Structure 1
Amino acid sequence: ATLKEKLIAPVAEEETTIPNNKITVVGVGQVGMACAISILGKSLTDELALVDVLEDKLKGEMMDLQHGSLFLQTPKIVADKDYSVTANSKIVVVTAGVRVQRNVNVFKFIIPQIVKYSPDCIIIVVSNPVDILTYVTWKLSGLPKHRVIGSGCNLDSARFRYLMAEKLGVHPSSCHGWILGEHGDSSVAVWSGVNVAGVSLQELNPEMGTDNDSENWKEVHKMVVESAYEVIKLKGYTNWAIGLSVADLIESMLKNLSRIHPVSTMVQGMYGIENEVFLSLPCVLNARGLTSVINQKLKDDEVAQLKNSADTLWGIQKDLKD
């Protein structure tokens, strides 16, 4: 006999069990590990799987997390370059790639392996350019559109609500405002929805968002766009904020909360867009994924920007093969 046999008397019979809320993180770079630690911190999964092509670094990150198991509530942390380790995931976060032509080749291999072992999963795409790669993930996986989610402008909106909170001196959760469309240079700041305690700030300042504004809100939007670039210049990358926002998305889905997030969904047929492109809009997230999108009253220039972004994205998307 062994010490396990002499100390522990089995009551329930032996079993190989399938986890209930397994999460897989593809890519253990700065972003992937930031997602992993935030996911573990919120006690969101009973099995965290890591996957990467760098076998040594992957094993090291896995061991480092396992050594903290005493302080967590995740009884199984696993990792391998073989995608069988991701089997039966509920949510798969894809952060792999360089930081379009190069990332599409990565996704052409990764996405089929994901749905081969987790056909019922939800896929959150984080790799840049995220709106284009969410389209690639949707096409390659064959999954319905409510199960392919691009992180999109969820982070851009968090940055905007932080800068707005700094102007007013209240908590970012008490400041409301949505950055929508394309994650990056061409995002759209819906000024009509910017409010505090239901007080529409554009009604107190109708020049909000224009070039003659005593409060300079166009500069705030510019700082949201330039935030990634400035932080990248200072520390080489960004990871902590995106990791926190991904865990926020996973919380809404795994707990089935039906909270509204500015994430990227397939917006063909909305606001006059005719191509299959992914853009960020207010979306309802729950245990089934992205089940609903909020219909908004967007001004002409806001719709014009969405149409322009959709044209720019599709112009890249149409030349991709297989």
Structure 2
Amino acid sequence: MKLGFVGAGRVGSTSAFTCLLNLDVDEIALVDIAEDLAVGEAMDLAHAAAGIDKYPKIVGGADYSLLKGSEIIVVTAGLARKPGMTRLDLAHKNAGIIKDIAKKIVENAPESKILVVTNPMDVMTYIMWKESGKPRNEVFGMGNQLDSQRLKERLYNAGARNIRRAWIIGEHGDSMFVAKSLADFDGEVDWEAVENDVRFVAAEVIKRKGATIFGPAVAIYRMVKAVVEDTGEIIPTSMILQGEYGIENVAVGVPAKLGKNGAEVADIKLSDEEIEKLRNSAKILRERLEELGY
């Protein structure tokens, strides 16, 4: 089991840490244009590793060669943004970097599953699958999981208990929605209040903490776990749809089955209103992609 990480920033490195803490990993690789940053992350992860009596190979640098062998690669590389500076501006910039990465991931680690995390995730996930020759089952994105984690919290807060299932699907962003039809938990809650908090929690945290890290790392871990350990679990995942729910040619968050073969749309029936909400999100995402020449 080798894990690959393109981007050794806050989320890349904490993701890798989390995985190291809970998975039987033999090798971890960290690629990043910031060469020294990637090496130092590697060094620090190794020191961490030695304290739980794990001793895997942890290499860090800037050559995509390091990725050779990876069963899966978490791509967090790019830029987050703010200081006024535009949404679409980063979309272009990152889209440039994502296209560029896919090419490198393919001429180095051809057979690796690719987990896209870089924002706007649904959009970058699509661009990744498009720019690499790969089948829609070897490229997907982390987002909804994290959204759902937030959901599961606001619920336990609002009284809910024995939360067996609770997901958020659709766009990882504004047009997201709770899949009420699948909620399973004891205790009455206010779906109004809850649906609301979640969407704006993302930035409520960013303005205070500076960025979102620990939430994202765990979500990423849960996905990687499901693949490296062939658990067969079902996790809201951003996936290229080719017909499902009347949607096509776009990535969007839908319940998926993760396992050694990557991801596959878990066929699960949704509310009639739930399909529209999904179709809306696809439209919005489809707009944003055409904006980019895809």
TM-score normalised by the chain length of structure 1: 0.83
1:169 and 1:266 mapped to 2: Cα distance? 33
Instruction: Work out whether 1:182 is the aligned partner of 2:171.
Output: yes
1:287 and 1:52 mapped to 2: Cα distance? 26
Instruction: State the shift of 1:149 in Å.
Output: 1.4
| 1:19-58 alignment runs, 5 A limit | 21-58=1-38
1:321 and 1:315 mapped to 2: Cα distance? 10
- Cα pair 1:161 1:175 within 8 Å, conserved: no
Structure 1 unaligned spans of 5+: 1-20, 206-214
- Cα pair 1:161 1:177 within 8 Å, conserved: yes
Q: Matched residue of 1:277: which SS?
A: strand
Q: Matched residue of 1:285: which SS?
A: strand
| Number of the residue aligned with 2:292 | 320
2:123 and 2:165 mapped to 1: Cα distance? 27
1:226 and 1:236 mapped to 2: Cα distance? 15
1:193 and 1:291 mapped to 2: Cα distance? 19
Q: Matched residue of 2:266: which SS?
A: strand
Deviations 1:68-107 (A, max 9, x none): 3322424200011010111111100000111110101111
Q: What letter matches 1:142 in structure 2?
A: G
| 1:1-322 alignment runs, 5 A limit | 21-72=1-52, 73-99=54-80, 100-168=91-159, 170=161, 174-196=163-185, 215-273=189-247, 275-300=248-273, 302-321=274-293
Q: Matched residue of 2:244: which SS?
A: coil
2:70 and 2:278 mapped to 1: Cα distance? 33
1:89 and 1:289 mapped to 2: Cα distance? 13
- Cα pair 2:169 2:177 within 8 Å, conserved: yes
Q: Matched residue of 1:67: which SS?
A: helix
1:304 and 1:69 mapped to 2: Cα distance? 46
Instruction: State the shift of 1:169 in Å.
Output: 5.8
Task: Report which of the two structures shows the higher radius of gyration computed on alpha carbons.
Answer: 1
How big is the alpha-carbon RMSD for the aligned residues of Structure 1 and Structure 2?
Answer: 1.7
2:14 and 2:101 mapped to 1: Cα distance? 20
1:131 and 1:59 mapped to 2: Cα distance? 29
Identity of aligned residues (%): 36
Of 107-116 and 230-239, more deviation after overlay is shown by 107-116
1:113 and 1:56 mapped to 2: Cα distance? 20
2:170 and 2:260 mapped to 1: Cα distance? 24
- Cα pair 1:185 1:225 within 8 Å, conserved: yes
Structure 2 unaligned spans of 5+: 81-90
Instruction: State the shift of 1:141 in Å.
Output: 1.0
Of 62-71 and 38-47, more deviation after overlay is shown by 62-71
- Cα pair 1:50 1:58 within 8 Å, conserved: yes
| Residues paired across the two proteins, number | 283
